[PDB]
Swiss-Prot record, chains A, B:
Family the entry assigns: Belongs to the TRAFAC class dynamin-like GTPase superfamily. Dynamin/Fzo/YdjA family.
Cystine connections: none
Organism: Homo sapiens (Human)
Function summary: Microtubule-associated force-producing protein involved in producing microtubule bundles and able to bind and hydrolyze GTP. Most probably involved in vesicular trafficking processes, in particular endocytosis.
Gene: DNM3
Lineage: Eukaryota, Metazoa, Chordata, Craniata, Vertebrata
Domain of life: Eukaryota
Residues included from the entire protein: 404 to 453 of 869
Subcellular location: Cytoplasm; Cytoplasm, Cytoskeleton
Protein name (Swiss-Prot/TrEMBL): Dynamin-3
């Protein structure tokens, strides 16, 4: 049985993890940018600084 | 298990049949040339023809 056929199919499946993985980074970026905006409401009294 | 490893070894073995096979042709050539020389003893009476 083709050793390389196994590898061929797997490599297809592994590549499919790029989507949900990049998405994850974005979901983190979202929570991070939300948090810096949450914190900086305590500095709102200074418009140019915030 | 490597499908190609099997093929690799066999091809080696088949190649080894060229020797005994060519030798066989010569062994036939030998008996053939012997036979024309046997037959032509009946024509020995004519030196230039034989």
């Amino acid at each position: 049985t083709p050793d390389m056929a196994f590898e061929a199919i797997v490599k297809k499946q592994i590549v499919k993890l790029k989507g949900p993985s990049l998405k994850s980074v974005d979901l983190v970026i979202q929570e991070l940018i939300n948090t810096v905006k949450k914190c900086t409401k305590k500095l709102a009294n200074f418009p140019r600084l915030c």
